[PDB]
Design a protein around this motif. Sequence first.
Motif, PDB file in Angstrom:
ATOM      1  N   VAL A  13       4.603 -44.399  60.496  1.00 22.74           N
ATOM      2  CA  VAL A  13       4.226 -43.095  61.026  1.00 22.74           C
ATOM      3  C   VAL A  13       3.236 -42.448  60.071  1.00 22.74           C
ATOM      4  N   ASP A  14       2.134 -41.933  60.619  1.00 18.59           N
ATOM      5  CA  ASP A  14       1.136 -41.238  59.818  1.00 18.59           C
ATOM      6  C   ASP A  14       1.645 -39.904  59.285  1.00 18.59           C
ATOM      7  N   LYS A  15       2.752 -39.398  59.814  1.00 21.25           N
ATOM      8  CA  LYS A  15       3.290 -38.113  59.399  1.00 21.25           C
ATOM      9  C   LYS A  15       4.222 -38.279  58.201  1.00 21.25           C
ATOM     10  N   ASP A  16       4.694 -37.146  57.686  1.00 19.89           N
ATOM     11  CA  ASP A  16       5.634 -37.115  56.577  1.00 19.89           C
ATOM     12  C   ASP A  16       6.644 -36.002  56.828  1.00 19.89           C
ATOM     13  N   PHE A  17       7.519 -35.779  55.852  1.00 22.04           N
ATOM     14  CA  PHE A  17       8.526 -34.736  55.982  1.00 22.04           C
ATOM     15  C   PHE A  17       7.872 -33.362  55.967  1.00 22.04           C
ATOM     16  N   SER A  18       8.405 -32.452  56.785  1.00 19.17           N
ATOM     17  CA  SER A  18       7.763 -31.155  56.972  1.00 19.17           C
ATOM     18  C   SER A  18       7.840 -30.303  55.710  1.00 19.17           C
ATOM     19  N   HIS A  19       9.021 -30.193  55.115  1.00 21.35           N
ATOM     20  CA  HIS A  19       9.129 -29.356  53.925  1.00 21.35           C
ATOM     21  C   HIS A  19       8.784 -30.165  52.682  1.00 21.35           C
ATOM     22  N   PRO A  20       7.940 -29.643  51.792  1.00 15.68           N
ATOM     23  CA  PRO A  20       7.573 -30.410  50.590  1.00 15.68           C
ATOM     24  C   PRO A  20       8.741 -30.701  49.669  1.00 15.68           C
ATOM     25  N   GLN A  21       9.823 -29.932  49.747  1.00 18.34           N
ATOM     26  CA  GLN A  21      10.988 -30.138  48.900  1.00 18.34           C
ATOM     27  C   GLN A  21      12.072 -30.970  49.569  1.00 18.34           C
ATOM     28  N   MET A  22      11.825 -31.466  50.777  1.00 22.79           N
ATOM     29  CA  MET A  22      12.766 -32.368  51.417  1.00 22.79           C
ATOM     30  C   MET A  22      12.804 -33.703  50.674  1.00 22.79           C
ATOM     31  N   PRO A  23      13.949 -34.385  50.677  1.00 20.38           N
ATOM     32  CA  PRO A  23      14.030 -35.683  50.000  1.00 20.38           C
ATOM     33  C   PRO A  23      13.082 -36.696  50.623  1.00 20.38           C
ATOM     34  N   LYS A  24      12.563 -37.584  49.780  1.00 20.85           N
ATOM     35  CA  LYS A  24      11.548 -38.546  50.184  1.00 20.85           C
ATOM     36  C   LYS A  24      12.129 -39.853  50.706  1.00 20.85           C
ATOM     37  N   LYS A  25      13.452 -39.973  50.791  1.00 22.05           N
ATOM     38  CA  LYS A  25      14.068 -41.221  51.222  1.00 22.05           C
ATOM     39  C   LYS A  25      15.441 -40.925  51.803  1.00 22.05           C
ATOM     40  N   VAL A  26      15.713 -41.472  52.986  1.00 19.60           N
ATOM     41  CA  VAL A  26      17.000 -41.325  53.654  1.00 19.60           C
ATOM     42  C   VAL A  26      17.575 -42.714  53.892  1.00 19.60           C
ATOM     43  N   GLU A  27      18.833 -42.904  53.511  1.00 28.66           N
ATOM     44  CA  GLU A  27      19.529 -44.171  53.675  1.00 28.66           C
ATOM     45  C   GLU A  27      20.539 -44.062  54.807  1.00 28.66           C
ATOM     46  N   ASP A  28      20.608 -45.106  55.633  1.00 25.30           N
ATOM     47  CA  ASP A  28      21.494 -45.137  56.796  1.00 25.30           C
ATOM     48  C   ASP A  28      21.273 -43.909  57.675  1.00 25.30           C
ATOM     49  N   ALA A  29      20.002 -43.595  57.901  1.00 24.02           N
ATOM     50  CA  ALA A  29      19.640 -42.383  58.622  1.00 24.02           C
ATOM     51  C   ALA A  29      20.078 -42.466  60.076  1.00 24.02           C
ATOM     52  N   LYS A  30      20.731 -41.411  60.551  1.00 26.51           N
ATOM     53  CA  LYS A  30      21.093 -41.271  61.958  1.00 26.51           C
ATOM     54  C   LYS A  30      20.049 -40.365  62.599  1.00 26.51           C
ATOM     55  N   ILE A  31      19.069 -40.978  63.253  1.00 28.38           N
ATOM     56  CA  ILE A  31      17.902 -40.264  63.754  1.00 28.38           C
ATOM     57  C   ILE A  31      18.302 -39.385  64.931  1.00 28.38           C
ATOM     58  N   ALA A  32      17.586 -38.275  65.099  1.00 32.37           N
ATOM     59  CA  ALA A  32      17.767 -37.371  66.232  1.00 32.37           C
ATOM     60  C   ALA A  32      16.387 -37.092  66.819  1.00 32.37           C
ATOM     61  N   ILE A  33      16.023 -37.835  67.860  1.00 35.20           N
ATOM     62  CA  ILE A  33      14.701 -37.710  68.465  1.00 35.20           C
ATOM     63  C   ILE A  33      14.728 -36.568  69.471  1.00 35.20           C
ATOM     64  N   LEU A  34      13.827 -35.605  69.299  1.00 36.94           N
ATOM     65  CA  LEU A  34      13.754 -34.438  70.163  1.00 36.94           C
ATOM     66  C   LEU A  34      12.311 -34.189  70.576  1.00 36.94           C
ATOM     67  N   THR A  35      12.138 -33.688  71.798  1.00 39.73           N
ATOM     68  CA  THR A  35      10.833 -33.283  72.302  1.00 39.73           C
ATOM     69  C   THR A  35      10.743 -31.778  72.514  1.00 39.73           C
ATOM     70  N   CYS A  36      11.667 -31.018  71.934  1.00 46.40           N
ATOM     71  CA  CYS A  36      11.662 -29.568  72.040  1.00 46.40           C
ATOM     72  C   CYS A  36      11.243 -28.967  70.710  1.00 46.40           C
ATOM     73  N   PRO A  37      10.208 -28.131  70.673  1.00 48.57           N
ATOM     74  CA  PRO A  37       9.869 -27.448  69.421  1.00 48.57           C
ATOM     75  C   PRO A  37      11.019 -26.563  68.969  1.00 48.57           C
ATOM     76  N   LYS A  88      23.485 -40.305  71.444  1.00 49.52           N
ATOM     77  CA  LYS A  88      22.041 -40.343  71.627  1.00 49.52           C
ATOM     78  C   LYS A  88      21.284 -40.468  70.313  1.00 49.52           C
ATOM     79  N   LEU A  89      21.985 -40.615  69.193  1.00 49.15           N
ATOM     80  CA  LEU A  89      21.352 -40.693  67.886  1.00 49.15           C
ATOM     81  C   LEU A  89      20.939 -42.126  67.584  1.00 49.15           C
TER      82      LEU A  89
END
Lengths: 98, 525, 49, 540
Positions: free
Chosen positions: D229-253, D351-352
């Motif tokens: 993905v060309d994108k990155d984490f939104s907040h600059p202070q968010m962690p740079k790596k997630v392990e065993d991530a349970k993704i939550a895909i949303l199309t709602c702003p 749905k995760l």
Amino acid sequence: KVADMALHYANKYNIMLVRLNSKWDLRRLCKTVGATALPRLTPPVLEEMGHCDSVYLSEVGDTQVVVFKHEKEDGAISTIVLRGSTDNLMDDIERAVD
Amino acid sequence: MMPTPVILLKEGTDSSQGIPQLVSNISACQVIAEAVRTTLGPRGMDKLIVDGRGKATISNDGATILKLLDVVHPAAKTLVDIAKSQDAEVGDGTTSVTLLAAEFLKQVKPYVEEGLHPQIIIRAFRTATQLAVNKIKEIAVTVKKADKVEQRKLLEKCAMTALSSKLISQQKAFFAKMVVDAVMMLDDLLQLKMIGIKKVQGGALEDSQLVAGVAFKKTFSYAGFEMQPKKYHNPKIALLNVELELKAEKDNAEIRVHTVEDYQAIVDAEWNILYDKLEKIHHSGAKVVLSKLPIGDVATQYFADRDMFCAGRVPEEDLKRTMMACGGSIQTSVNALSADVLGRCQVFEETQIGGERYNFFTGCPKAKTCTFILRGGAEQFMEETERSLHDAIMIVRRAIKNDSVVAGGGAIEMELSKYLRDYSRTIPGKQQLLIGAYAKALEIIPRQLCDNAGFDATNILNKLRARHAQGGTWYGVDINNEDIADNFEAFVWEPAMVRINALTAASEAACLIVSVDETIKNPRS
Amino acid sequence: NVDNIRVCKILGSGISSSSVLHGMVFKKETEGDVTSVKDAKIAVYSCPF
Amino acid sequence: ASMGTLAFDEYGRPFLIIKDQDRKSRLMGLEALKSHIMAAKAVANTMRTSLGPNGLDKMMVDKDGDVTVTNDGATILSMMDVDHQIAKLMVELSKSQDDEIGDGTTGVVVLAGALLEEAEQLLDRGIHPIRIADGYEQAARVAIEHLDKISDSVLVDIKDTEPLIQTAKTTLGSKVVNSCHRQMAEIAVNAVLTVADMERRDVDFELIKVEGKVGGRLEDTKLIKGVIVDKDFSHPQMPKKVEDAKIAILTCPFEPPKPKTKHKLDVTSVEDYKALQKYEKEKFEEMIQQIKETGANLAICQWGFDDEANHLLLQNNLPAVRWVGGPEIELIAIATGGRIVPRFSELTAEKLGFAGLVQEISFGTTKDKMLVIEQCKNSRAVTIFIRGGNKMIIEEAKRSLHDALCVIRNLIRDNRVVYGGGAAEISCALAVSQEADKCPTLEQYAMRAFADALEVIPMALSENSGMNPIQTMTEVRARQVKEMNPALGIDCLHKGTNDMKQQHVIETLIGKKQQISLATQMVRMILKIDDIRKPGESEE
Ligand SMILES: Nc1ncnc2c1ncn2[C@@H]1O[C@H](COP(=O)(O)OP(=O)(O)O)[C@@H](O)[C@H]1O
Ligand SMILES: Nc1ncnc2c1ncn2[C@@H]1O[C@H](COP(=O)(O)OP(=O)(O)O)[C@@H](O)[C@H]1O
Ligand SMILES: [Mg+2]
Ligand SMILES: [Mg+2]
């Protein structure tokens, strides 16, 4: 113009639709069928309802036409269908008909 | 000319009068005819015409070539008009009409030059054309048995003859069988719009297929489409005319609220309207959803979650074809999605076709429509294939209407010429020269066939004339054998109406050109 | 009335194929699915449908 | 020789037939045929140098001065700025070969040029071009039957991929990425096999994401069984790596709701203002709580979100990414096994999506960050990440990988193969030659011309490699006749042997069949044209 929902519900009840843009054609059709051009979507009364012997979609040459046909040898309006191999020839024949 | 101080017409009005303008008109008709001569018969060639924008077109059809020619001569435009007329009424013979008319004019040109009254020529053309049409109707072979196999073979042979002049002539048997099969599915009107023709670039000509159903290109799927299954073994198809998106209720709808609870209720009401439409569609039992109007990403994801297939912005003609193939109804509202308004096909599948994605509906037993998928190495290649298939389709339709055939390859022209000469020997003599000229002009078709094929035209014409005079009706040019042969037994079959309309249109055009004595051209505004 | 005689020009088959029809011909198509009626009961509306 | 006709009548009156006829041009018959043959020969002779492992590249410059270095024939002809109609036909033939097969875009042009070159001499001998086209068609039929005869089957099974590796290597041999030959071939094979419907069905290319970033090395190109993905984490202070991530895909702003219909919310008192402010704050808190309740670790949004939602996500240990594209959203949902959720009210645990590792990747001194979603359970989507020393080799590697993927897709569709290096061409030419002897005399010339045209591919391969064309081709043909072995070709790599079966030079059978078919059809179409009517206006 014909609305999409109106076309749907007309198709549901097996009703044939013809959309004449020119008011002259509508008036001539009213003359040749005997109907009255209603200004609202109210159902037509017995006298205002037109009658015809047969209405169908047909193809002559490569042009699709809608034909309002009377079986009787009478009517207010009669049409002459001119065939030909050239538009100019048919125009000349139309001038002769005039 | 004496310059009048005030002239009658406007400046620049050009007028040509008398015999010279008639001769010039005949020469112009000859010039138009020679631009399409080489495209006649199995040995005919193609023409490449480039428009102003540089988009070239390649065609073997006379009508297409004439239309792409920017003809401005008023007398020459009659040939283009009669070519269009022949294409419209019949669909085949758009070259024979032009050659026949030009040959009539060329034959009567010497008599025009010597002051013969054009009305005499017009009357002679009318008489000769009436006699030729009556002879064609009399001698045309008809099958009075209504046998299925015989009538199908007649259709296939007619399609093969109509196809054995194009670049698909090598696969003419394959394409004629496909065309006959396609035409026999149409119900009663044989409408052209019920025979889809899709052109997919890449692939051999033999890779072209006819689907007993409907197929069309994938139409801009939204996100979440790739999780929908792409194969169904007995789907129910919901043909719809509905926009399944979150949007304003109407273009003139305004919502006025004064409480946050009402705001939330309005948002939930919009969502509930969309979900009610989607839930009604889902509970209708359908698995494939098609809509003329766009289908949004929310609806696409909803259908993906239900293992259903959706496709928005489907073209209107494609929806009509799907309706005719499967037997449903294009529903503008989803309130009553009963079992009788849902289409049904044996197998629906989305497959890769030469770098593109196509949705396939197959197995329809009551289908009244079909779709051609034409493969080729170029856009113009597939366009010419489509034109050839159109010619074959029109020929097969006309044969379906009436199964009266005559042998091609100039056999009918020789028979008509012999009959007209025999008639001309028994008339006082002023009409005799003109009717003989008409009969001689009828010989243009086999002569042009021999010229295109590289034969010696004179010897072939002599042999054909001798054979016709001594007995034999269906003897014409045999291209492969460099000689003549019985074209009826060679299955060079064309419908009688083709030659009938060709002769009628050529005669009418020739009479119209001959009847003109003056041409007045006003200056352009 | 002269205007009661209408002329329809359809190209293709030569003037000898011309015919007279007791009615009218419109070079158009039908909006809906029904394409033929045998005992027509036309109801004409001048307003949009 | 042009300008159509010009007579102006024998009575001296003006004779105008076609609009602007005095500024138009036309060619008829043998002159037009010779011009077409000359143009096609020029195009084919230009293209023939880019054939084989020793083939050379063409540097193409577009209108804006951008430069692409490539060996792909279809790309070369597409970017080439032609005006001749026959040249456009050659370009379109190459594009057709690219579309249907994906490989062999250069062989078709050379074959068509050779066929038309032989047809030139045939026409000079006095043969109708239709006869030449028919002879070419039936010779092509014989050649296709022989190709089917001499074909061999391979295993497309996942457990053993060695034939697939060899086929991909043969495809990539002519490209510049041969410096990482086996690695590139293996990643292409793994990519195709991963995203494929098993039962000989289609291989869908929207499930393959090809991305190229400058820097690094070409050897650093790797196969990612996930999504880049060309994108990155939104907040600059968010962690740079997630392990065993349970993704939550949303199309709602992550914004307060907004009805689509035109609307107005009336505020009529101070209490209304307080209620509106509380509504906004509670909507933010409620959406964050709804995301958190499912137990998700990462939230992926498509339409972005504002500061309050960003800080709430950071505060609740919920890394998030915004403004992800729709195709990327679909790819993430496919790979991670999650479902696309349109609003938080419908978000549930089932749905995760689950990803083994979500990481942000730096690219040196560039400030450019990209996101990796890999280590999925049963990822049904795959991504190829390409590195290089400059963007030009990156684009060339992209198209070479596309060629390899197309070849493996063709192998999946049909597992029959033939051995390249000109061996197939030589065998087809021999079959056509044997067929010509039994044929009547008239079509013998067309069949022999077809065979001689088929012999051009071994000639081009030998000439590009420095060997003498005629001697090498004649020796290989004599060896093929002497011992029945349709696997003897042109040893372009000078490995010592001529047996391409041993050298593992493998090509798809359908590729060769499509090459011959398309070349024959285009040659027939050109041979059937005997007239040109260009505007000739020399417009600007
Ligand atoms: N196999 C054949 N042998 C001899 N003549 C043929 C053959 N096929 C077609 N023809 C002749 O070629 C003529 C032209 O047909 P074609 O070029 O297909 O369309 P058009 O009539 O519009 O030129 C027909 O009049 C027909 O008699
Ligand atoms: N290792 C090899 N040895 C001999 N010939 C080869 C080898 N690899 C490829 N070739 C030949 O080079 C020709 C050109 O292949 P390539 O340039 O990859 O694509 P295209 O066929 O589009 O030009 C092929 O026909 C193939 O037979
Ligand atoms: Mg024809
Ligand atoms: Mg290659």
